[PDB]
Every structure is written in C-alpha cells, then in structure tokens.
Structure 1
Amino acid sequence: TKVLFITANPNSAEGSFGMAVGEAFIEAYKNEHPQDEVVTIDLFNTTVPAIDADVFAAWGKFAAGEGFEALTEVQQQKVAAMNTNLETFMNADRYVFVTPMWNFSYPPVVKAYLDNVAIAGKTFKYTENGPVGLLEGKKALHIQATGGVYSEGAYAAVDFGRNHLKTVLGFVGVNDTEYIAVEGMNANPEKAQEIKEAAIANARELAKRF
C-alpha cells in the first residue's frame, strides 16, 4: 500500500494543531503497517504550478497534437511539475490531507494541488449524464484544524475547505473519505490542550482501521 501524506500548513507538528494530529495519525499508521510506503508531500515546499496562460498555451499545443519541444522552457517546467504531481497522486492507494481553516477555507496551494490532480482523461472522464471519476480502490482522510466549531450544525454550511475537498475527491473517484476535525481551540482556549489530545486519540484509533 502507497500512502501520500499531503500537508498544507506552514508550521510543523510542534506549532500546529492539525499537524500534531496528522503526525500522530501517520505514525500510528506506519507502526500498524511497517511494510507500507508513505511519501510526504509538503505543499508549502513542493512545486505546484497554478493553471495560467503558460499552461493553457501548453495544453493547446498538446491538443494540436504537438510534442514537448514545442513548449517554451517555462511551459516545459510547469507541465513537468504538473505531470509529476498527477502521476504520484494517481499511483498512491491512500491520501491524508492536513489543513488549517483560513477565512472559511483551506490555504490556496490546496486548490492549486487539486487543479494538478483533477485531469480529464486521467482522473475523470465525460459521460452521457456527466463527469465520472476514473480512480478506483482509493481511500482518503481529511484532518482539519479550525478556530470555531463547524463539523455539524448550521455552521457546517460555511465549512468550505472540507466540503470542497470532499467534492473534488468524490469527483475523481475517491468516494471513501474520512474526516477528523480538531476544532474549537480559539472559541475555548482553556480547552485547547484537551481538544488536541482527544483528536490525537481519535487519529490513533483511526490508524488501526484505515
């Protein structure tokens, strides 16, 4: 089994609630499955090209059935990085995403990564009734840390990071998703440590059945 541990937090497990929880998850997981390969993708230190005029131009050459040498140097560099990211995603069996909630959503590089990974003909295809995913046999976990509480109730409707990430994963075929919220630390700073510990314990149990 190949696992991607995809993190989008500028802070380490020492200074981030999500990363402490994701770290506890991924280490309990390796312990349970010492023969599994686990690759960390730190999105703040990975090249994750934004879809821009260069990518659109590169795509036009490929659609025009042209080769890689028709691209400029920067287009080449952009496409080769997008290709790597796509190919690593497609080949792994399990995905762990760790995000903080910023302004009701995830950090911008998460959308940039999703844009690398959701590709027609590769991870989804067009159907008589509309798009369907191509990826089969995958499972995903989203661990999200949030100042307030959005995991259930009325505030769930503004949890855009979680809701959008789950939608795109389902769109590419990854309908088997798990969710861990590390929530309420800013609404109750007195309970932050126990909130963290409870989610850590939640993650370590999840590791035994993921």
Structure 2
Amino acid sequence: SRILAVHASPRGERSQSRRLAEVFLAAYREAHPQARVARREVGRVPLPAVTEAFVAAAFHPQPEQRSLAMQADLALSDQLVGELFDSDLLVISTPMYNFSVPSGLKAWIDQIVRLGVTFDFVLDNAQYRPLLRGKRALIVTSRGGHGFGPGGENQAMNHADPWLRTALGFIGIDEVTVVAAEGEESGSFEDSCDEAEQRLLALARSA
C-alpha cells in the first residue's frame, strides 16, 4: 500500500494538523511495515500558483504539440499528479486559515486538477468526468475556534475541509474522511486533540 501525505501548515514542530497526521502515519506504518509513505510539503515550501502559461499549456487543444517550454510549465504539475496516481491513500493535513485553507494547499489543488489527466469532459448539446479511481483520502485539520463542524454554530463559515471534499470529488476521490481538532487558540483543546488522535489510531490500524 502507498500513502501520499500532503502537509499544508507552515508550522513545523508546533503544527497540530501536521502532528496529528504524523500520529496517523506512524500508527499506519506500525501496522503495515511494508507500506510506502511519500510526503509532499506545501506549507513550509512555496508551491507556485497557476500562471497564464500553465493555463495555456494545460488547456492546449493538441497536447502532444506542446513545446518544450510548455512542458517546463507543466513539469511540476506532472510530478504532483504522478504522486497522487502512485498513491492508494491521500492524507492532507491542514489548518483552517481565514475560513479556508492556507494558500499553498490551494496552489497544490490548482496544480493537480488537470484536463485529460485527473478529469476530462465531452460536449453534449461540457459534461465533466473524474479520472482518479480507487483512491481514498483522509483530511486532518486543526482550527483555532469552535463550531465549524457539522451542527456547529459556524458550520456555514467553513470553506476549508468541505471545499477540499468538493475539489477532490471532482477528480474522483469520493471516499473522504475528515478528522478535526477545534479550540487550538484557547487551548478542551487537549480533549479535542486527544479525541482526534484516538480516531486516527483506529483509522490507521483498521485500514
């Protein structure tokens, strides 16, 4: 089995989303000594935004005719997509930043949603089709505040993990589990972290 872990917090040792995700990965490895884990850093590394050159290349009507310069514009995207194609399970760790995700993780999504590679379309009278099959995802997220989850007072303000679900679903990753810790700013954060940890150990050991 093959895991791709995408870490989105810019924090290091102090990132709770990174820490929780790494609890999961360690527990998974304990149960699956032969599994391979690849990490793609998008929080502590600036992941480039989509440019006009990326757009021209990624939507070129005859992709085989792309110049070597166009291929250079897509080289990073190709690498990021390949990582996902090589994986069975995608783990994304992310803070909530201003009701969404850190910009680096948005840039990652923007590199991996690719016409003819992770989705396609046909024209009837465009009808989109996902191209990733057989994958699952786990989103591990930390939030300073409270009530962003289902039934929460602030649920409507959450454009972080629900948005990720939609973006991933578009390319075919429909089986998505979310594990959230809340209260990081106040610090019953211990309880929320403890609950997230236990949930992640159960998930790792059953996978």
TM-score (norm 2): 0.88
For 1:51 and 1:76, how far apart are their aligned partners in 2?
A: 14
Offset, 1:27: 0.6
Deviation string 1:110-155 (CA, Å, 9 cap, x unpaired) is 1111111111211112155821211111010001100112112242
Secondary structure class of the residue paired with 1:34: coil
Q: Which residue of 2 aligns with 1:152?
A: 150
Q: Which residue of 2 aligns with 1:81?
A: 76
Unmatched 5+ stretches in structure 2: none
Cα gap change, 1:91/1:47 in structure 2, threshold over 3 Å: closer, same or farther? farther
Deviation string 1:147-205 (CA, Å, 9 cap, x unpaired) is 1121122422211011110001111111000010011232x42x222322221112111
Residue identity matched to 2:184:
M
Moved more, 101-110 or 125-134: 125-134
For 2:24 and 2:156, how far apart are their aligned partners in 1?
A: 27
Q: Which residue of 2 aligns with 1:63?
A: 62
From the two aligned structures, give the one with the greater helix fraction.
1
Please, what is the CA RMSD of the aligned residues? 2.1
Please say if residues 9 and 100 of structure 1, whose CA atoms lie closer than 8 Å, have aligned partners that are also in contact: yes
Please say if residues 2 and 36 of structure 1, whose CA atoms lie closer than 8 Å, have aligned partners that are also in contact: yes
For 1:138 and 1:61, how far apart are their aligned partners in 2?
A: 27
For 1:76 and 1:64, how far apart are their aligned partners in 2?
A: 10
Please say if residues 47 and 81 of structure 1, whose CA atoms lie closer than 8 Å, have aligned partners that are also in contact: no
Offset, 1:58: 3.4
Q: 1:1-210 alignment to 2 at 5 Å?
A: 1-12=1-12, 14-45=13-44, 48-59=47-58, 63=62, 65-69=64-68, 71=69, 76-127=71-122, 128=124, 130-149=127-146, 150-153=148-151, 154-186=153-185, 188-189=186-187, 191-210=188-207
Please say if residues 180 and 199 of structure 1, whose CA atoms lie closer than 8 Å, have aligned partners that are also in contact: yes
Cα gap change, 1:63/1:50 in structure 2, threshold over 3 Å: closer, same or farther? farther
For 2:9 and 2:172, how far apart are their aligned partners in 1?
A: 25
Secondary structure class of the residue paired with 1:163: helix
Secondary structure class of the residue paired with 2:93: strand
Deviation string 1:47-69 (CA, Å, 9 cap, x unpaired) is 63321122234347673753433
Secondary structure class of the residue paired with 2:38: strand
Unmatched 5+ stretches in structure 1: none
Secondary structure class of the residue paired with 1:167: helix
Cα gap change, 1:177/1:37 in structure 2, threshold over 3 Å: closer, same or farther? same
TM-score (norm 1): 0.87
Residue identity matched to 2:84:
F
Cα gap change, 1:84/1:64 in structure 2, threshold over 3 Å: closer, same or farther? closer
Offset, 1:91: 2.0
For 2:105 and 2:63, how far apart are their aligned partners in 1?
A: 30
Residue identity matched to 1:146:
R
Residue identity matched to 1:17:
Q
For 1:34 and 1:118, how far apart are their aligned partners in 2?
A: 31
* Matched pairs, number: 203
Runs of 4+, deviation exceeding 6 Å: none
